[PDB]
C-alpha cells in the first residue's frame, strides 16, 4: 500500500500499549485529573467527593474531537466524552451507589470534558488551569431545542416548560461540525432509569427503548427520583439525543438537538450536500436497530460560523433500508435507500400512532419500524471519507441475528454473529442529498485460524495475522487512512483465539488491506480518535482498563487502580502517523 507505512504488529495480551517499530505513546490525561488551578488531586482510595469529580476529567473516556486554535498552531482544544463509570473503582466500597452523594458522583463521571492542549516543543500536553477547561456532566443545566422542545412528552414536574434539562450522560461518541462545534451522543441512557414500582407496566415506546424497573445495574433511582419512572416517566424522553457544545465558549449552555431524533446514538458523521446543506449520518446501537440520516433545511455558511447557530433545528430525518444484495459470501454488494420520517408521509400518521412530528422524533425507533427500515447488526461509528465521500459504518456484532424478526441477508449475512463487519456506501452521484446509494461490506470480521473456509473465517482481507472482532470506532486521517478501533471479546480463546486484547488497525479503503497498528492493555476497549492538525500525533482512548480486574494501567503501582486514559501516539522520527518512514 501507498497509504500503509508500518508493518502489521502481532496480537498481544500484555497490560501495556503495543505499537510498531519507531512509535511511542504517552498519557495525555486520565480519569480523575483536576482540570482547574488548585483543583483536587485524584484520590486512588476512592474517597474523592462528587463535587471534586465535577471538576475532574470524567471516567471511561470515549469519543473525542480536536479543534484548532485560531492563529496559534501550538494550541488546541479537545472535547472528550465520558461514557460511564466503573463502580469497583469509583467508590471505596466498590459496589452499587449507597446514597444521593454516590449517585451525584456517578453522574459527575459522565458527560464531556473540554480541555486545552499545548505543544511547546513537539509533544502535546494538557494545560491544567486553562480558561477553556470545563466539565459538562450528568447534573449540568442544558437546553432542549428543535421540533420536540416544549412538547407535552418533554415536560416534567421539575421542568414544566419542556425546554430545560439536567445533564447529558452515557455520552458515547462524537461529531465535529464545520461551524466550530462539538456533537456528543447519548447512547445507553435507558440503563440509568428504574422504578420504585417493581410491577410498573411500561408502554410500547418505553418497552421499545428497553427501560426496566430494576435499571441495568446502575441503581440511581433509589436515591435520585429524577431516574424513577414511577415519579418522573417523561424524564426518559429528555435523554437519547445529540447534544451540541461550543468548546470555545466555556459559559455557553449545551443544546439537545431534537431534530436529529431520539435513539441510542453512537456518533454523528458530518457531510454536506452538493447544494450546501448539512448532513449527519447516525447509528442506533442496539441489536436489530437502524441507521439514520439528517439533512438540514438551510445551507452551511462556512465563513460566518455563528450564522449556523441553529442549523440543526430545521431539516429532515431519514432511516435506511438495504436490499438483500447479490449474496456473494466474500464481498456482498447491493443498493439501499433513505426513507423519510415525517408525520403524514410513508404511513406515519394517526393510524400508526403518531399525532405530530414531535412524537415521530421522540419515538424515532417506532416511526422507523412503520416505514420498514432494515434491522441492523448494531451500528456503531460512522465516518465519511475526506477523499471520496464514501461512508463507512461498523456493525459490531449481533448474537441474535437469525432469530424471528432478524433474518440473515444483505449487509447482515451471518446468524449468531460474534465478529461483526464494516459496511460502506456510496451516495448516488456522490451527492449526499441523494436518497439512494450503493453498499458493500468492506470487511467481514472472522477467525481464519479457527474457522477457515466457513463464514466465521471472515472475508479474504482478513488473515490470521490481522484478525480482530467487534470493530466499533472509526476515524479517517487527512491522508485517507481508515483507522478501525475494537471493542470485542479479549479472551484470546475459543472463537477469539489469537486476537488478543482490544486494538486499533489501519486500512486502505481503495484496496481493502488491513494491518494491525496498536494493542491496548488488559480489560480495556480502544475508543476515541483524533489527530493533531499536522497528523504527527494520533490521540486514542483506552476505556475501562481492568473492567474485570487484572489491570494497573497506566501507572502500574503495586495493587494499583487502573484509569481510563487518552493516549498520544507519535513517531520517534516526528513524522506523520501511519505514513512511510
Ligand atoms: Ca462504542
Ligand atoms: Ca461497542
Ligand atoms: Ca463498549
Ligand atoms: Cl480486566
Amino acid at each position: 500500500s501507498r497509504l500503509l507505512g508500518f508493518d502489521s504488529i502481532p496480537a498481544a495480551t500484555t497490560d501495556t500499549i503495543s505499537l510498531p517499530k519507531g512509535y511511542k505513546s504517552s498519557v495525555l490525561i486520565s480519569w480523575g485529573q483536576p482540570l482547574h488551578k488548585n483543583g483536587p488531586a485524584f484520590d486512588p482510595s476512592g474517597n474523592g467527593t462528587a463535587a471534586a469529580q465535577e471538576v475532574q476529567f470524567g471516567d471511561n473516556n470515549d469519543g473525542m474531537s480536536l479543534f484548532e486554535f485560531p492563529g496559534e498552531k501550538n494550541r488546541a482544544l479537545m472535547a472528550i466524552n465520558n461514557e460511564y463509570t466503573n463502580y469497583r473503582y469509583l467508590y471505596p466500597h466498590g459496589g452499587m451507589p449507597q446514597s444521593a452523594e454516590d449517585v451525584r458522583k456517578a453522574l459527575a463521571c459522565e458527560g464531556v470534558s473540554v480541555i486545552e492542549v499545548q505543544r511547546k516543543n513537539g509533544q502535546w500536553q494538557f494545560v491544567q488551569g486553562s480558561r477553556y477547561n470545563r466539565r459538562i456532566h450528568g447534573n449540568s443545566p442544558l437546553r432542549i431545542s428543535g421540533p420536540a422542545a416544549g412538547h407535552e412528552l418533554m415536560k416534567t414536574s421539575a421542568d414544566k416548560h419542556g425546554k430545560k434539562v439536567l445533564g447529558t450522560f452515557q455520552n458515547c461518541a462524537n461529531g465535529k461540525t464545520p461551524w466550530g462545534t462539538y456533537l456528543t451522543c447519548e447512547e445507553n441512557f435507558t440503563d440509568c432509569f428504574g422504578s420504585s414500582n417493581a410491577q410498573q407496566q411500561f408502554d410500547p415506546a418505553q418497552k421499545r427503548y428497553g427501560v426496566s424497573a430494576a435499571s441495568r445495574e446502575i441503581n440511581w433511582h433509589p436515591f435520585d427520583p429524577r431516574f424513577d419512572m414511577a415519579k418522573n416517566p417523561n424524564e426518559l424522553n429528555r435523554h437519547g439525543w445529540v447534544v451540541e457544545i461550543d468548546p470555545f465558549d466555556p459559559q455557553s449552555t449545551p443544546v439537545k438537538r431534537t431534530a436529529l431524533g431520539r435513539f441510542k446514538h453512537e456518533n454523528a458523521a458530518l457531510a454536506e450536500t452538493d447544494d450546501g446543506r448539512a448532513v449527519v449520518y447516525m447509528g442506533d446501537d442496539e441489536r436489530g436497530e437502524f441507521i439514520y440520516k439528517f439533512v438540514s433545511r438551510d445551507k452551511i455558511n462556512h465563513r460566518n460560523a455563528k450564522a449556523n447557530r441553529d442549523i440543526l433545528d430545521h431539516g429532515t430525518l431519514y432511516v435506511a433500508r438495504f436490499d438483500a444484495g447479490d449474496g456473494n459470501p466474500d464481498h456482498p454488494k447491493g443498493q439501499g435507500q433513505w426513507i423519510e420520517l415525517t408525520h403524514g408521509k410513508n404511513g406515519i400518521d394517526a393510524s400508526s400512532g403518531f399525532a405530530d412530528q414531535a412524537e415521530v422524533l421522540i419515538h424515532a425507533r417506532l416511526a422507523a419500524s412503520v416505514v420498514g427500515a432494515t434491522r441492523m447488526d448494531r451500528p456503531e461509528w460512522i465516518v465519511v471519507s475526506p477523499k471520496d465521500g464514501q461512508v463507512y459504518c461498523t456493525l459490531t456484532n449481533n448474537a441474535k441475528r437469525g432469530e424471528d424478526g432478524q433474518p440473515v441477508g444483505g449487509p447482515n449475512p451471518r446468524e449468531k454473529n460474534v465478529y461483526g463487519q464494516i459496511l460502506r456506501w456510496r451516495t448516488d452521484r456522490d451527492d449526499h442529498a441523494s436518497k439512494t446509494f450503493a453498499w458493500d461490506l468492506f470487511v467481514v470480521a472472522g477467525n481464519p485460524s479457527v474457522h477457515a473456509g466457513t463464514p466465521k473465517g471472515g472475508s479474504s482481507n482478513i488473515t490470521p495475522q490481522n484478525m480482530f472482532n467487534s470493530p466499533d470506532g472509526l476515524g479517517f486521517d487527512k491522508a485517507g487512512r481508515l483507522w478501525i478501533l475494537t471493542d470485542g471479546d479479549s479472551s484470546n480463546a475459543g472463537d477469539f483465539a489469537g486476537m488478543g486484547n482490544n486494538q486499533m488497525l489501519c486500512a486502505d479503503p481503495a484496496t481493502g488491506e488491513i494491518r494491525r497498528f496498536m494493542v491496548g492493555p488488559i480489560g480495556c476497549e480502544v475508543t476515541g480518535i483524533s489527530f493533531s492538525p499536522d497528523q504527527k500525533t494520533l490521540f486514542v482512548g483506552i476505556q475501562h482498563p481492568g473492567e474485570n480486574g487484572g489491570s494497573t494501567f497506566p501507572e502500574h503501582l503495586p495493587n494499583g487502580k487502573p484509569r481510563s486514559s487518552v493516549m498520544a501516539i507519535t513517531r520517534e522520527d516526528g513524522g506523520i502517523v501511519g505514513a512511510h518512514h
Side-chain angles (χ1 to χ4, degrees):
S1 185
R2 166 191 60 84
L3 278 179
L4 303 178
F6 64 91
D7 292 339
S8 193
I9 72 173
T13 57
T14 47
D15 200 27
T16 63
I17 295 289
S18 300
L19 285 162
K21 303 97 115 102
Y23 283 83
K24 58 182 157 67
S25 65
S26 200
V27 172
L28 181 71
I29 189 161
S30 302
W31 165 50
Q33 173 64 49
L35 302 188
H36 307 304
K37 183 179 174 173
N38 305 316
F42 177 68
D43 184 350
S45 75
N47 289 125
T49 65
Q53 182 63 76
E54 293 177 344
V55 296
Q56 288 163 339
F57 195 73
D59 209 350
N60 287 352
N61 49 267
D62 204 334
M64 60 180 172
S65 295
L66 182 148
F67 296 82
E68 285 186 297
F69 207 95
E72 297 282 354
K73 70 180 179 49
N74 288 331
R75 301 174 76 187
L77 301 183
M78 297 177 72
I80 303 155
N81 292 349
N82 298 115
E83 190 182 43
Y84 68 110
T85 187
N86 315 298
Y87 291 162
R88 68 188 302 148
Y89 302 129
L90 182 60
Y91 303 121
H93 55 74
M96 296 293 175
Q98 293 182 0
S99 68
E101 276 289 320
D102 282 359
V103 170
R104 181 189 175 179
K105 189 169 163 175
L107 282 153
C109 284
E110 305 184 14
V112 176
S113 302
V114 182
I115 65 176
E116 179 176 344
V117 296
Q118 278 181 13
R119 182 167 41 187
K120 255 59 260 159
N121 40 23
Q123 171 181 19
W124 289 98
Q125 307 174 293
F126 173 56
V127 184
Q128 191 175 337
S130 166
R131 74 173 294 263
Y132 295 98
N133 294 350
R134 182 182 187 182
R135 285 304 316 290
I136 299 153
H137 57 68
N139 275 314
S140 294
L142 273 59
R143 178 173 129 241
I144 308 168
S145 203
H151 194 266
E152 286 307 308
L153 288 174
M154 304 293 277
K155 296 176 183 183
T156 60
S157 56
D159 178 33
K160 301 184 194 309
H161 302 309
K163 293 183 169 170
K164 291 176 183 191
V165 54
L166 284 176
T168 182
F169 54 79
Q170 291 285 167
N171 301 76
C172 182
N174 65 303
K176 177 175 181 186
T177 74
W179 51 94
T181 65
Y182 182 67
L183 304 179
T184 185
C185 291
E186 299 165 350
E187 186 196 24
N188 290 301
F189 70 94
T190 52
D191 292 359
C192 299
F193 291 81
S195 184
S196 53
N197 176 11
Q199 292 80 36
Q200 177 114 24
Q201 298 297 293
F202 294 110
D203 70 35
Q206 290 166 339
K207 288 183 165 178
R208 178 56 181 281
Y209 281 73
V211 74
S212 79
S215 88
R216 197 178 302 277
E217 290 168 330
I218 300 304
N219 302 315
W220 295 348
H221 65 278
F223 307 97
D224 181 345
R226 187 155 71 93
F227 299 95
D228 183 353
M229 294 292 293
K231 293 173 178 183
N232 295 292
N234 288 355
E235 189 68 8
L236 198 72
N237 297 329
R238 291 143 57 82
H239 302 279
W241 306 99
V242 178
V243 183
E244 190 171 4
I245 293 162
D246 181 357
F248 286 93
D249 184 357
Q251 285 72 56
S252 64
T253 302
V255 185
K256 307 213 178 187
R257 295 294 185 189
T258 66
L260 279 59
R262 175 168 164 276
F263 51 87
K264 303 185 185 178
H265 289 272
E266 184 100 10
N267 88 328
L270 271 286
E272 186 179 330
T273 69
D274 289 0
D275 70 3
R277 299 181 295 138
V279 178
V280 191
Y281 296 104
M282 297 173 286
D284 181 11
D285 179 10
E286 189 171 325
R287 290 181 278 276
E289 291 291 352
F290 309 132
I291 296 164
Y292 299 77
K293 174 189 190 187
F294 171 83
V295 185
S296 69
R297 182 189 69 197
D298 296 339
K299 295 175 164 53
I300 299 168
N301 187 328
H302 283 271
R303 283 105 182 142
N304 189 353
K306 70 186 168 51
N308 306 289
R309 184 176 67 189
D310 300 301
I311 194 177
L312 299 183
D313 283 344
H314 308 282
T316 311
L317 187 64
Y318 302 86
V319 70
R321 188 188 293 172
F322 299 83
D323 75 11
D326 66 356
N328 189 284
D330 196 342
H331 189 211
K333 303 173 188 75
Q335 290 277 131
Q337 71 183 287
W338 297 108
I339 304 173
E340 186 173 339
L341 301 182
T342 291
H343 187 273
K345 300 190 190 182
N346 298 317
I348 301 163
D349 57 30
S351 67
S352 56
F354 299 91
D356 58 36
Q357 187 56 17
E359 290 184 359
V360 174
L361 294 162
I362 296 166
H363 296 150
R365 288 187 165 184
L366 292 176
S369 293
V370 163
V371 313
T374 302
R375 297 188 75 184
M376 304 299 290
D377 287 356
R378 291 189 62 194
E380 290 200 283
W381 297 40
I382 301 172
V383 292
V384 182
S385 169
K387 295 295 191 185
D388 74 358
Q390 293 197 82
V391 188
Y392 295 75
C393 182
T394 53
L395 300 172
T396 199
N397 52 58
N398 186 358
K400 295 171 154 184
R401 180 59 59 179
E403 299 183 355
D404 187 74
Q406 296 191 65
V408 174
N412 307 288
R414 295 176 299 189
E415 70 171 3
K416 302 171 185 183
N417 174 24
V418 303
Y419 298 114
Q421 58 268 12
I422 305 177
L423 173 64
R424 168 164 56 191
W425 62 92
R426 184 176 180 178
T427 196
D428 192 48
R429 314 177 296 281
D430 299 311
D431 187 354
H432 291 281
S434 294
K435 295 182 179 193
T436 72
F437 55 82
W439 67 267
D440 72 291
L441 293 186
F442 178 69
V443 68
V444 181
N447 193 325
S449 288
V450 179
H451 295 297
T454 75
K456 278 173 188 180
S459 54
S460 56
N461 50 338
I462 295 302
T463 67
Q465 198 293 144
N466 70 5
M467 59 180 177
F468 59 93
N469 78 96
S470 305
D472 179 333
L474 294 176
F476 273 106
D477 62 26
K478 289 176 190 181
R481 283 169 284 270
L482 177 66
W483 298 88
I484 298 163
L485 290 69
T486 79
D487 174 25
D489 188 299
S490 304
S491 70
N492 195 37
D495 276 350
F496 311 102
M499 292 175 169
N501 293 354
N502 281 303
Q503 60 194 260
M504 184 163 61
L505 308 100
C506 194
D508 183 337
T511 68
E513 190 179 353
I514 298 165
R515 296 183 188 184
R516 190 180 297 106
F517 177 80
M518 189 188 71
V519 183
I522 294 173
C524 83
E525 65 192 80
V526 176
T527 189
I529 184 170
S530 302
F531 287 84
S532 59
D534 64 14
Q535 314 286 278
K536 296 169 172 182
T537 303
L538 188 168
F539 301 103
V540 60
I542 298 306
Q543 191 193 52
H544 60 73
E547 67 180 352
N548 298 316
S551 184
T552 58
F553 181 93
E555 292 167 277
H556 296 308
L557 297 173
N559 290 302
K561 178 169 286 182
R563 301 164 67 185
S564 295
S565 298
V566 177
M567 309 303 291
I569 310 303
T570 55
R571 284 163 53 168
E572 289 171 342
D573 69 12
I576 289 167
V577 169
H580 285 85
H581 297 266

